[PDB]
Amino acid sequence: DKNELVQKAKLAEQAERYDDMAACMKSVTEQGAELSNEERNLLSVAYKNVVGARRSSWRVVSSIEQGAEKKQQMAREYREKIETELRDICNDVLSLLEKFLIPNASQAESKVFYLKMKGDYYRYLAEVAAGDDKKGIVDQSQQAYQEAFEISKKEMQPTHPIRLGLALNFSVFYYEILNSPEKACSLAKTAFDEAIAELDYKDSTLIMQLLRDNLTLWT
Amino acid sequence: DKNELVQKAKLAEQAERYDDMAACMKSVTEQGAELSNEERNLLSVAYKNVVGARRSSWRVVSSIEQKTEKKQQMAREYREKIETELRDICNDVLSLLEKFLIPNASQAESKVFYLKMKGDYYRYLAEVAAGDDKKGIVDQSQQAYQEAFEISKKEMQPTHPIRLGLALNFSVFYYEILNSPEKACSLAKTAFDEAIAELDSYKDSTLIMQLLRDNLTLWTS
Amino acid sequence: SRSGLYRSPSMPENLNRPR
Amino acid sequence: YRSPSMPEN
Ligand SMILES: O=P(O)(O)Oc1c2c(c(OP(=O)(O)O)c3c1[C@H]1C[C@@H]3c3cc4c(cc31)[C@H]1C[C@@H]4c3ccccc31)[C@H]1C[C@@H]2c2cc3c(cc21)[C@H]1C[C@@H]3c2ccccc21
Ligand SMILES: O=P(O)(O)Oc1c2c(c(OP(=O)(O)O)c3c1[C@H]1C[C@@H]3c3cc4c(cc31)[C@H]1C[C@@H]4c3ccccc31)[C@H]1C[C@@H]2c2cc3c(cc21)[C@H]1C[C@@H]3c2ccccc21
Ligand SMILES: O=P(O)(O)Oc1c2c(c(OP(=O)(O)O)c3c1[C@H]1C[C@@H]3c3cc4c(cc31)[C@H]1C[C@@H]4c3ccccc31)[C@H]1C[C@@H]2c2cc3c(cc21)[C@H]1C[C@@H]3c2ccccc21
Ligand SMILES: O=P(O)(O)Oc1c2c(c(OP(=O)(O)O)c3c1[C@H]1C[C@@H]3c3cc4c(cc31)[C@H]1C[C@@H]4c3ccccc31)[C@H]1C[C@@H]2c2cc3c(cc21)[C@H]1C[C@@H]3c2ccccc21
């Protein structure tokens, strides 16, 4: 039953048990029905926490890889273990997006939400990609964001937190996946100004602060 | 290979992967040699994070069970799921303590530390036990702590952070497990006073003293 | 400042139920 | 709520 699994996911969230939360919300998605605003956020939060712990530990361990010989083979091998978990997680999320979420989104709002997620999880693979697959993985991330950005700009108002949220992440893609301090600052500054322009709810104004914080930092 | 497992445990700690860290230090303990002070600390840090996550998680889900018709069934079945993880973690640590760590402990310091740990992990089982096994588990915890308390009174300075830490935890056992606020308050107060008396080279001791006094100020007015 | 503790400044997990 | 026992550090 869908409502059982959704309520379990909420219990799992309060318990800070995100593997359980993600598993529950995976089952919900696999039942083929279009998710509510509540359900897509539960799914998003769950997987973001699950993948986020791997990203964090990957960075620490990679940074230790920067000395001796036998010590740095062990860090390397451990990094590889973390990457293989990270990729399995990213690939679970991307299959859900392809088989269920993106093809059932009846509204522009949820279409942009899911194309942003697709962007996000391909960006996470790109952070961890080698010389070969990177350029191809990196471009899949770009197409996902670009389609999201296009739908967002015609269908959604500049203050809408999904539009602003897309902008923040697409800016971050440009800055640290593509070394374009320019194209990141461009995206972010327009989104901020275009959202400032149409002040004529609490999430919007927070993402606006995050967007400017990134400009302030990167100057 | 004992050295490599320790280095792996240290990586896991930096990575904040605690199940891995625990797995590694368990394997070190299982090789049967006495742990160094560093290996001891890695072992206790590892399992504290592993057990701790289940404890917090258990508390939150317990709170919900109370405030929740047959939705409170689902909370109960989840609480039980979290308990069996918790109990398995505690029973792992307790086996290591009996089969290896307590018997090989050659200094008072190590013995108090591992007996304190034994007290801690029976205390975690007791927090979550049913009324049939509770008083029996409570007993084991009280014994372990008591044995540690006696050894540290004869053998260690009142400022030794292991002695003060035992005092802190043993207070907590009295307050939270047995329902004796004044028996808990006495133990903490003497431990603190005895430490202040020895003042008139470590900064971890004064931190534990501050925690002792914070428990006093809380537990009575 | 980019060290081993650096977080990527994207969307965080905010506006969710605390207890 | 926290149990006021020994912290990790
Ligand atoms: O010159 P620094 O201040 O010491 O910073 C750079 C570093 C390094 C640099 O080389 P790199 O380009 O191959 O990553 C760089 C820097 C400065 C100069 C170059 C670099 C590149 C980049 C940035 C800063 C730096 C911004 C834009 C781009 C970037 C990607 C990801 C996060 C943040 C950034 C090394 C060494 C150092 C560094 C730190 C890390 C890592 C690697 C390094 C690993 C683990 C941690 C990290 C955080 C986020 C992603 C990946 C990592
Ligand atoms: O992520 P990488 O593929 O390792 O890119 C870096 C490169 C290089 C790096 O070393 P460098 O700092 O001496 O140029 C770096 C990188 C990563 C790591 C280091 C670096 C530094 C920096 C950035 C990314 C990188 C962001 C922040 C800082 C930077 C300055 C100008 C534009 C963008 C950035 C080399 C090799 C490569 C590179 C590319 C270029 C150039 C030089 C390089 C010349 C020509 C083109 C370019 C574009 C813009 C300005 C200048 C150039
Ligand atoms: O009077 P209250 O403010 O409502 O607090 C008590 C509660 C409850 C009380 O009954 P209980 O002790 O049989 O569980 C009590 C209280 C007050 C009165 C009684 C109680 C007992 C105790 C304390 C405060 C209270 C201090 C000393 C003893 C205790 C044990 C563990 C942590 C803190 C304490 C229920 C209901 C409420 C409560 C809260 C919790 C829990 C259970 C309750 C679960 C989940 C969470 C918790 C935290 C720490 C350990 C265990 C739990
Ligand atoms: O957690 P429990 O094992 O079920 O203990 C509680 C009891 C009871 C509880 O309800 P209560 O508030 O009406 O006494 C409680 C508990 C737990 C939950 C609640 C409670 C409240 C309190 C404590 C523990 C408990 C700590 C903090 C507060 C308290 C007051 C005095 C001594 C110790 C405490 C009942 C039933 C039981 C209890 C025991 C006694 C008594 C009454 C009870 C009489 C006689 C003896 C006692 C000792 C000290 C003072 C008074 C008594």
Residue closest by Cα to atom 5 of ligand 2: A179
* CA A44 to mean position of chain CA atoms: 8
List the domains of chain A with CATH numbers: 1-219 (1.20.190.20)
Contact B184, B171 (CB under 8 A): yes
D1 lines ligand 3 (CB under 6 A): yes
Q: List Cβ neighbours of A212 (8 Å cut-off, separation of 6 or more).
A: A188, A192
Minimum-distance ligand to the CA of A65?
1
Contact A188, A167 (CB under 8 A): yes
Nearest-CB residue to D8 (from B45, B59, B214): B45
User: Which of the 8 DSSP states describes residue C19?
Assistant: -
Token code pair at residue B43: 């072992």
Token code pair at residue D4: 């006021």
Size of interface A-C (CB pairs under 8 A): 40
- Nearest-angstrom CA–CA distance, A20 and A12: 6
Q: Which residues line ligand 2 (CB under 6 A)?
A: A 179, 181
Give B197-201's long-range contacts (Cβ < 8 A, gap of 24+): B197/B158, B198/B157, B198/B158, B198/B159, B199/B159
Technique behind the model: X-ray
C19 chain-A contacts, CB cut-off 8 A: 14
Nearest CA in chain B to A5: B74
**Resolution of the solved structure (Å):** 2.5
Nearest atom of ligand 4 to the alpha carbon of B180: 33
Q: How far is CA B180 from CA B19, B25, B172, B173, B175, in A?
A: 35, 36, 10, 9, 5
Chain A interface, Cβ < 8 Å to C: 13-14, 45, 48-49, 55, 59-60, 62-64, 120, 165, 168-169, 172, 176, 202-203, 206-207, 210, 213-214, 217
Say what the alpha-carbon torsion angle B192, B195, B199, B200 is, to the nearest 10 degrees.
80
CA of A160 to the centre of ligand 2 (A): 34
- Nearest-angstrom CA–CA distance, B23 and B181: 37
Q: How far is CA B79 from CA A22, A93, A189, B117, B130, in A?
A: 18, 28, 48, 24, 13
Q: List Cβ neighbours of B55 (8 Å cut-off, separation of 6 or more).
A: B86, B124, B127, D3
User: Which of the 8 DSSP states describes residue D1?
Assistant: -
Contact B2, B31 (CB under 8 A): yes
- Nearest-angstrom CA–CA distance, B193 and D4: 19
DSSP state letters, A93-157:
HHHHIIIIIHHH--SHHHHHHHHHHHHHHHHHHHHT--TTTHHHHHHHHHHHHHHHHHHHHHHS-
Token code pair at residue B102: 């307590």
Token code pair at residue A29: 């998605």
Q: How many residues does chain C have?
A: 19
Is A15 close to B71, i.e. CB distance below 8 A?
A: no
